[PDB]
Design a protein around this ligand. Structure first.
Ligand SMILES: COc1ncc(F)c(N2Cc3cn(-c4cccc(S(C)(=O)=O)c4)nc3[C@H]2C(C)C)n1
Lengths: 251, 217
């Protein structure tokens, strides 16, 4: 019915935390291996470059995500091995939420960082397979249909992080306990924002279900990378089973 | 309601070596599950190819949900529809112990502690059934709309039967992600059993469909 002051401010904190994190990730734009232009040379090395480029983008996402989690009230009050178990499981999911957030239905394209725009086919040229690419864009479309604002996204991301059923979570009771106010806040916010649309809240929670499937489809993508001898950087290998992450938290 | 929870409750009530015993109980329940689906409002109004698709996509999470709730009063195990029990120790000797624990923790225990009633279960299963993301569907919007009516019936029921528990509706829905992951992992084990004493309807369900069609007519 009504939105507590503590709730208003937490949501503000979350929205703030996100924008701060995207401005830090834009710093890294000239850092990134450029995307090869013009016709590909016989050497084959434009493949390797596209794949390195995409991969460096993911890395930046992981960094952005860790910086974000650290700003989520409660997250740091958890044990360090739980922090990791939580960020491992949820990275791909959040990556997929962010991806959708950066999707444009009119160009059917996804914009990473400031102005790196990629089509379905760019995704294929960068080494990902259609069995993965299509679900990513189906998901983006579904997300667009929902029309989430910056607060709804931020909340849904926090809720996602505090999923007690991840592998190797040692204090699950605490994680559900942390999750619960964020779910409560989302209920209130959505019910005030759009009182005529009572279905917004459950629709949103059901995307958490979708993301479990997509996580799975993403494991299938990792399968195929090893089958093609595409090798992921250390941080991505660490996080998707193929030390560092600990360091990123410790900073 | 256009998705009346009473009718959904009626449908749940109208249906009353570890690895082998599980496949055997699964084959048994697939038959029952078709009769259960038929008694969910509007399921049978859908095109027949869509009824098939939805059951093919849902059966696994649907059987897990029901054997989980059925096991609420069992200690350190689950109760199969065959009437036979399965306990942690067995599950582990059979190399199925990790997923077994996850079921107990994330479903059986949670269901018990909430006293998840038979209507609330029914609604969750109807939500699982009516999955607009199942591939091949003639009209996915049709199915999304049915799913949504279950959202609405359910929340109302929760506010009316459990008004003092403001977080109840969401507590129920947040079982669904854990179920999905758990379900994917069980599908995996069922696929392995297939690559190595298996039955006929279950077999049909694991291939990429004549028994199912028959059964709905
Ligand atoms: C199978 O796993 C995998 N292998 C190789 C990849 F290149 C990859 N990428 C490349 C990427 C960038 N991001 C990504 C997501 C949000 C925001 C940004 S950002 C910070 O550049 O805006 C990048 N996510 C991925 C993932 C995938 C979901 C497309 N994933």
């Amino acid at each position: 019915v009504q939105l507590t002051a503590a709730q208003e401010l937490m949501i503000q904190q979350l929205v703030a935390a996100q924008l701060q994190c995207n401005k830090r990730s834009f710093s890294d734009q000239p850092k990134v291996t450029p995307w090869p232009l013009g016709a590909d040379p016989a050497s084959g090395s434009a493949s390797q470059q596209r794949f390195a480029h995409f991969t460096e983008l993911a890395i930046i996402s992981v960094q952005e995500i860790v910086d974000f989690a650290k700003q989520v009230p409660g997250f740091l009050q958890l044990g360090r091995e739980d922090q990791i178990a939580l960020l491992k499981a949820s990275t791909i999911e959040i990556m997929l939420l962010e991806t959708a957030r950066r999707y444009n239905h009119e160009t059917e394209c996804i914009t990473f960082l400031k102005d790196f725009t990629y089509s379905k086919d760019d995704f294929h040229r960068a080494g990902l397979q259609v069995e993965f690419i299509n679900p990513i864009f189906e998901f983006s479309r579904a997300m667009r249909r929902l029309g989430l604002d910056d607060a709804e996204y931020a909340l849904l991301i926090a809720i996602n992080i505090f999923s007690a059923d991840r592998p190797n979570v040692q204090e699950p009771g605490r994680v559900e306990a942390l999750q619960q106010p964020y779910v409560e806040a989302l209920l209130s916010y959505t019910r005030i924002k759009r009182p005529q649309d009572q279905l917004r809240f459950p629709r949103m929670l059901m995307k958490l279900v979708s993301l479990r499937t997509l996580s799975s489809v993403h494991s299938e993508q990792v399968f195929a990378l090893r089958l093609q001898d595409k090798k992921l950087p250390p941080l991505l290998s660490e996080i998707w089973d193929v030390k560092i992450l600990h360091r990123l938290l410790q900073d | 309601e256009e998705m009346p929870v009473d009718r959904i409750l009626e449908a749940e009530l109208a249906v009353e070596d570890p690895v082998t015993n599980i496949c055997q109980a699964a084959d048994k329940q697939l038959f029952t599950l078709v009769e259960w689906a038929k008694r969910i409002p509007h399921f049978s109004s859908l095109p027949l190819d869509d009824q098939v698709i939805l059951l093919r996509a849902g059966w696994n999470e649907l059987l897990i949900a029901s054997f989980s709730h059925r096991s609420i009063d069992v200690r350190d195990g689950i109760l199969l529809a065959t009437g036979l029990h399965v306990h942690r120790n067995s599950a582990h000797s059979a190399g199925v112990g990790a997923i077994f624990d996850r079921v107990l923790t994330e479903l059986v225990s949670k269901m018990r502690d909430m006293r998840m009633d038979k209507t609330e279960l029914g609604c969750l299963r109807a939500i699982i059934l009516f999955n607009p993301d199942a591939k091949g569907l003639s009209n996915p919007s049709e199915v999304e709309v049915l799913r949504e009516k279950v959202y609405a019936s359910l929340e109302t029921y929760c506010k009316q039967k459990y008004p003092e528990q403001q977080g109840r509706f969401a507590k129920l829905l947040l079982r669904l992600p854990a179920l999905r992951s758990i379900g994917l992992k069980c599908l995996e084990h069922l696929f392995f059993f297939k690559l190595i004493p298996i039955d006929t309807f279950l077999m049909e369900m694991l291939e990429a469909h004549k028994i199912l069609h028959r059964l709905l007519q």
